[PDB]
Amino acid sequence: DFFDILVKCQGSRLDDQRCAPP
Amino acid sequence: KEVKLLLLGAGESGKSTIVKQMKIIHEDGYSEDECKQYKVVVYSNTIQSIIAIIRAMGRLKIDFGEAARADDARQLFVLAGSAEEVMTPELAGVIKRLWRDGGVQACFSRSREYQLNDSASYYLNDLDRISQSNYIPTQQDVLRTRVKTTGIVETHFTFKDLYFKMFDVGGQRSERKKWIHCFEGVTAIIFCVALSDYDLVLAEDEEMNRMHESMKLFDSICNNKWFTETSIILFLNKKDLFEEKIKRSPLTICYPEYTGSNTYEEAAAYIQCQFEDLNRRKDTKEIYTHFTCATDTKNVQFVFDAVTDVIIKNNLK
Numbered sequence: 001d002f003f004d005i006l007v008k009c010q011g012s013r014l015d016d017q018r019c020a021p022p
Numbered sequence: 023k024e025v026k027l028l029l030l031g032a033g034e035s036g037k038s039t040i041v042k043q044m045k046i047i048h049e050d051g052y053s054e055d056e057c058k059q060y061k062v063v064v065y066s067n068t069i070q071s072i073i074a075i076i077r078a079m080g081r082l083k084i085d086f087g088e089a090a091r092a093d094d095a096r097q098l099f100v101l102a103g104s105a106e107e108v109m110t111p112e113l114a115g116v117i118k119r120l121w122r123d124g125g126v127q128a129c130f131s132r133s134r135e136y137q138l139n140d141s142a143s144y145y146l147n148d149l150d151r152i153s154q155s156n157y158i159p160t161q162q163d164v165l166r167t168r169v170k171t172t173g174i175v176e177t178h179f180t181f182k183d184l185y186f187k188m189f190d191v192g193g194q195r196s197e198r199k200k201w202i203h204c205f206e207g208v209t210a211i212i213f214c215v216a217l218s219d220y221d222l223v224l225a226e227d228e229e230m231n232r233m234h235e236s237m238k239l240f241d242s243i244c245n246n247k248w249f250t251e252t253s254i255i256l257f258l259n260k261k262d263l264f265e266e267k268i269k270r271s272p273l274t275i276c277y278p279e280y281t282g283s284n285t286y287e288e289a290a291a292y293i294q295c296q297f298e299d300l301n302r303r304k305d306t307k308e309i310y311t312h313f314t315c316a317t318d319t320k321n322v323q324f325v326f327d328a329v330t331d332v333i334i335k336n337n338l339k
């Protein structure tokens with residue numbers, strides 16, 4: 001149950017406004 | 023002895039930023055070669071930010087000051103890949119003119135009604151400095167860089183005669199092994215929270231505001247029976263933005279039942295109280311709270327120092 005909460009709240013990281021690493 | 027530190031907390035809470043900071047403080051820091059490398063990244067983030075504000079202007083229906091600036095937008099999307107290699111003075115001119123517009127600033131001032139990164143204004147205000155052809159990024163500029171992460175971020179260092187391994191997990195369960203080992207044998211957990219997200223408008227893809235999400239996550243972590251022997255450290259980050267915001271937007275947005283005044287101090291106290299109250303093992307487990315600003319290298323240095331001392335003292339018993 002803990003892990004699905006973990007992911008249910010995390011990943012909303014705005015991947016636009018964010019570029020690829022060098 | 024070895025120390026396993028684990029950074030947790032929702033996206034946009036400063037974890038990667040904390041890591042970069044660690045690289046600056048206890049390691050050599052970022053050299054001129056690397057600083058040179060991050061240039062393109064800086065340009066990119068700047069552009070993506072201003073673009074994001076522009077697209078945001080749409081959904082809210084926000085008209086420009088002088089209509090002419092509209093043309094720049096059209097040009098912008100074309101020149102968006104022109105920096106993929108150095109900013110054209112034409113392009114930098116565009117960005118300058120746009121950021122100068124009052125309506126754009128009204129949208130930026132209304133950035134709670136959408137999703138704008140917190141490294142925007144930093145890059146946009148210091149435009150003249152970075153739009154020079156001979157520009158080399160400062161360490162602080164690198165700190166504010168936003169890089170898409172795909173895997174597990176790790177950094178190790180030696181400090182106060184101790185061996186630290188620090189892990190930022192992110193979200194990719196594309197790696198389902200080692201990922202879990204990041205939760206194995208942890209010395210202490212550092213939960214990060216963006217305070218400034220108290221007044222954020224409820225997105226259509228949310229069932230509760232971001233703060234209550236962070237709360238629920240914390241609840242799940244503290245009272246998890248796997249971390250009974252793990253020291254819990256809370257970073258109420260982005261305190262600066264919180265202080266600026268709290269003068270205008272009430273806490274009632276986030277907690278309607280809040281009766282206190284809207285002073286930074288009293289508010290922050292209410293938040294800290296709210297998080298700490300979730301510990302359903304208050305006797306056995308104590309929570310180590312700090313108010314951080316991950317962009318302030320000095321602050322992070324001090325906070326981390328104090329945390330380290332805490333851990334040592336815990337090690338002597």
Ligand SMILES: Nc1nc2c(ncn2[C@@H]2O[C@H](COP(=O)(O)OP(=O)(O)O)[C@@H](O)[C@H]2O)c(=O)[nH]1
Nearest residue numbers: 033034035036037038039140141166260315316
């Ligand atoms: N002004 C300000 N900006 C911050 C603070 N902490 C983080 N940020 C910015 O917030 C942005 C997102 O933070 P990020 O490192 O991605 O947090 P993460 O999602 O947990 O990894 C970064 O570009 C930082 O520059 C803070 O205390 N003050």
